[PDB]
Design an enzyme around this catalytic site. Structure first.
Site, mmCIF file in Angstrom:
data_model
loop_
_atom_site.group_PDB
_atom_site.id
_atom_site.type_symbol
_atom_site.label_atom_id
_atom_site.label_comp_id
_atom_site.label_asym_id
_atom_site.label_seq_id
_atom_site.Cartn_x
_atom_site.Cartn_y
_atom_site.Cartn_z
ATOM 1 N N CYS A 7 0.814 -1.227 0.000
ATOM 2 C CA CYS A 7 0.000 0.000 0.000
ATOM 3 C C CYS A 7 0.846 1.275 0.000
ATOM 4 O O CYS A 7 1.697 1.445 0.905
ATOM 5 C CB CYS A 7 -0.954 0.028 1.204
ATOM 6 N N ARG A 44 -0.291 4.495 3.075
ATOM 7 C CA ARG A 44 -0.178 4.308 4.533
ATOM 8 C C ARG A 44 0.119 5.506 5.434
ATOM 9 O O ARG A 44 -0.013 5.379 6.636
ATOM 10 C CB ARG A 44 0.796 3.175 4.874
ATOM 11 N N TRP A 79 -9.189 6.283 -0.961
ATOM 12 C CA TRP A 79 -9.353 7.038 -2.174
ATOM 13 C C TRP A 79 -8.357 6.615 -3.242
ATOM 14 O O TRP A 79 -7.290 6.080 -2.929
ATOM 15 C CB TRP A 79 -9.343 8.562 -1.888
ATOM 16 N N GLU A 94 -4.108 4.439 -10.994
ATOM 17 C CA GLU A 94 -4.926 3.234 -10.947
ATOM 18 C C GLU A 94 -6.006 3.347 -12.013
ATOM 19 O O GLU A 94 -6.273 2.406 -12.779
ATOM 20 C CB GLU A 94 -5.563 3.084 -9.570
#
Ligand code: HEM
Ligand code: HEM
Ligand SMILES: Cc1cc(N)nc(CCc2cccc(CCc3cc(C)nc(N)c3)c2)c1
Ligand SMILES: Cc1cc(N)nc(CCc2cccc(CCc3cc(C)nc(N)c3)c2)c1
Ligand SMILES: C[C@H](O)[C@H](O)[C@H]1CNc2nc(N)[nH]c(=O)c2N1
Ligand SMILES: C[C@H](O)[C@H](O)[C@H]1CNc2nc(N)[nH]c(=O)c2N1
Ligand SMILES: [Zn+2]
Lengths: 404, 403
Positions: B107, B110, B279, B284
């Site tokens: 991720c 974070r 979000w 992406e």
């Protein structure tokens, strides 16, 4: 079912198993507890088995495994270690091991060409002037006025209690890095130390952003001697954009021949401390890393300002825009100058082709994903979606301590 | 034994000492690194995992070794000793879920790990109920474009019985319809899940952006089908700041990225349904979802639209169109006033996150191939940062598809 790593390509949905990794005789940096994949830097009996393994690879590769010529060469090698502690490669064994080394290099995207390499044997070389000569022949041959050819010059191997043959420069062609008395760097900041080293051994330094460094060359047990490459041999390409007319006025340039000179070539135990090799560039090495890294030429902001972008914020994607044009300028200029280069799309495609060949030939291909994926447009290239197994085979290229 | 971790842009060096807390093995061995693979292929274990976690909780709130600490360890021994399992107190659950995000090596988001809204859904006995909870989470998380991160934790897995599951891989997903000629209309990644939806009685659309219904399953029952009320699904029509033609492509994307197929492990307990959302980072949508050859595959079309030389890789048409598509996304989200983050801001902030984690814990597991964005990697600071990957718990895992 198969207890070898399963390897998947997520774009096409295809699957392979790497059986080649079983052949690895050296541990890498990872463990079940943690993965260290992203880090850059991680004797009689011991030598003989490495030598036996290699000779076995040699005979395999010419299809004479188990033959009496194979068992004779094996015998000849052990006899030579028995009495001298080292041994030596036949000419054609060096040619095979050197190619095999390039073939085995996990971080090289150019491997589709592995079998097309000119091996210059320079195991007769006995002085620093002679290394110079050898290197000039190399550059001359490899450069071939633009139509670049892969080559490697091999100097004599490490000997017991005898100095190494060393090329001090990390590449045969390198721009000077001049530390300023205002902290900043003029030229290539990657080359600060080697520049300082050249000056200290009596090079009269230049003043520019692109001064070609002299060679610092070291015969066994001698201080290194300094050698200026005659300019007419160092092919450079002035950089200009196909449509942005002002890019030419930046006075950016790069040299044609990427020739690495600080690596150790290890073959069946034997170690060749000076075995410089060269190919041709991928466009992102110059356009993205060399010209845009913050710790290199760092031209990104300069270019985006010229392109009139908003650099006060990130969400303008001003860095991505400039990076692309700088890259396009690398390709266009090389193409115009008729000098071999390969763009990151063409290059990765050919690496996928290589992966398929190696699957058939060896049962897998050691590959380092973080390094095979280019530094722009990653997921736009087929390798990004290809799982990869990384492991150390031999012969290999290895980093080594800087001679100083 | 403690890995030296270097930043090649700044020449700075740290040491990971947090990786010594790993209790679960990864895919690598000394012989070969498998760090680029996507999937990794009883009273004593649970008791000790349980212990370790409760410790993490009390130490987290500095009450370690104290009264309520020893007495909670007893509650846990007692409960496992006689029932082979146990239960988490809401606050411990709240802590575990924050920590599982914190521990998520792939991720990039974070920095935010501490700002997480946690919904306890452990009192759920029906797909019906699951849905109601799912809608609350969506309403909350979406907040009229001002996205807030959230998780909703459904009841834990249990020895005797089937799992609570949400079949959909994300809470919002576009249909993928396998057409006559092995072609795909809509999102190709969701062909299998569209097919399942149709099998369980959904009337399909035929567009490219048909929000799928949710298949929710309570233990040992068939799954049930629920249609999200279209007003709860905030979507952003994509336009480009200078290219007037881009809107004519009719492209769009949903505001809320909420994952729903991942198992949440806390102190040896497993939560097979615990959807979470935050979000989008723009790449992406702009790069993976729209330009991946096995997704919407819009790269060529845009490029032709841009009148670029498609004939050749060297014209960098691929890279150029990709940049503009990623721009359209940021512009569009910015225009519709919906939280989004570009890959430059995200990785800048992730760098700051590694710094806090260094001071606070002695390291941070991270996965270099996933932290570095899919375009312009080396233009971001994470590219030059060495990273150690390893598994800490609490954790999110993958789990098999329930069908
Ligand atoms: C033929 C054209 C070639 C291309 C396009 C090419 C490309 C590359 C690239 C892009 C890298 C990563 C470099 C970086 O980012 O620093 C690399 C690494 C490497 N290359 Fe190739 N190369 C070529 C030929 C060769 C040749 C002839 C050799 C040696 C015989 C070679 C040996 C290596 C090795 C050993 C590495 C690993 C470097 C390391 O371990 O850090 N390549 N190559
Ligand atoms: C809030 C802003 C967030 C951003 C910008 C963000 C960004 C990302 C990105 C780009 C990925 C890579 C995954 C991919 O490309 O498919 C990722 C992975 C991941 N994220 Fe975050 N995320 C955010 C919030 C969250 C939240 C709230 C959670 C859970 C509490 C979470 C948990 C995870 C996990 C577990 C993964 C790894 C999945 C795997 O191993 O495949 N993220 N995140
Ligand atoms: C032959 C060749 C082709 C190409 N396209 N690019 C290059 C330059 C990139 C390249 C290739 C191999 C090896 C290196 C660096 C080796 C190296 C050596 C040491 C001691 N430390 C390091 N960090 C790195 C760099 C070389
Ligand atoms: C919270 C969040 C934020 C964000 N910016 N993006 C996402 C979506 C990316 C994401 C994150 C975690 C997990 C996944 C699941 C990927 C995934 C994994 C497996 C095994 N199977 C699948 N079908 C899919 C995807 C989620
Ligand atoms: C930390 C990271 O591994 C490091 O910056 C690597 C990433 N990938 C790379 N890939 C290539 N080809 N060259 C590099 O220098 C790097 N740098
Ligand atoms: C095989 C390869 O690891 C795979 O394509 C990974 C690479 N890096 C990634 N990084 C992110 N953030 N998301 C991904 O889905 C992937 N895919
Ligand atoms: Zn590894």
């Amino acid at each position: 079912g198969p207890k070898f790593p399963r390897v998947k390509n997520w774009e096409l949905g295809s699957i392979t198993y790497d059986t080649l990794c079983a052949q690895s005789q050296q541990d890498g940096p990872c463990t079940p507890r943690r993965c260290l994949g992203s880090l850059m830097l991680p004797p009689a009996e011991q030598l003989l088995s490495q030598a036996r393994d290699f000779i076995n690879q040699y005979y395999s590769s010419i299809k004479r495994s188990g033959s009496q010529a194979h068992e004779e060469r094996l015998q000849e090698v052990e006899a030579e270690v028995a009495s001298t502690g080292t041994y030596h490669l036949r000419e054609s064994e060096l040619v095979f091991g050197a190619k095999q080394a390039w073939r085995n290099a996990p971080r090289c995207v150019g491997r589709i060409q592995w079998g097309k390499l000119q091996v210059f044997d320079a195991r007769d070389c006995s002085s620093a002037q002679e290394m110079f000569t050898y290197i000039c022949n190399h550059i001359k041959y490899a450069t071939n006025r633009g139509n670049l050819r892969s080559a490697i010059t091999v100097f004599p191997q490490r000997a017991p209690g005898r100095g190494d043959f060393r090329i001090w420069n990390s590449q045969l062609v390198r721009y000077a890095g001049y530390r300023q008395q205002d902290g900043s760097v003029r030229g290539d900041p990657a080359n600060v130390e080697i520049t300082e080293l050249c000056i200290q051994h009596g090079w009269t330094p230049g003043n520019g952003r692109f001064d070609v460094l002299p060679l610092l060359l070291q015969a066994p047990d001698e201080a290194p001697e300094l050698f200026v490459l005659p300019p007419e041999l160092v092919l450079e390409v002035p950089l200009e954009h196909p449509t942005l007319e002002w890019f030419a006025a930046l006075g950016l340039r790069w040299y044609a021949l990427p020739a690495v000179s600080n690596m150790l070539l290890e073959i069946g135990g034997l170690e060749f401390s000076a075995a410089p090799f060269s190919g041709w560039y991928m466009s992102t090495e110059i356009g993205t890393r060399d010209l845009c890294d913050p710790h290199r030429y760092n031209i990104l902001e300069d270019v985006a300002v010229c392109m009139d972008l908003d650099t006060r914020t990130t969400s303008s994607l001003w860095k991505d825009k400039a990076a692309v044009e700088i890259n396009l300028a690398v390709l266009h200029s090389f193409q115009l100058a008729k000098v071999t280069i390969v763009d990151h799309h063409a290059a990765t495609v050919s690496f996928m082709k290589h992966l398929d060949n190696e699957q058939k030939a060896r049962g897998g291909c050691p590959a380092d994903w973080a390094w095979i994926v280019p530094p722009i447009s990653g997921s736009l290239t087929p390798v990004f979606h290809q799982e990869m197994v990384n492991y150390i085979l031999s012969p290999a290229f290895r980093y080594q301590p800087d001679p100083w």
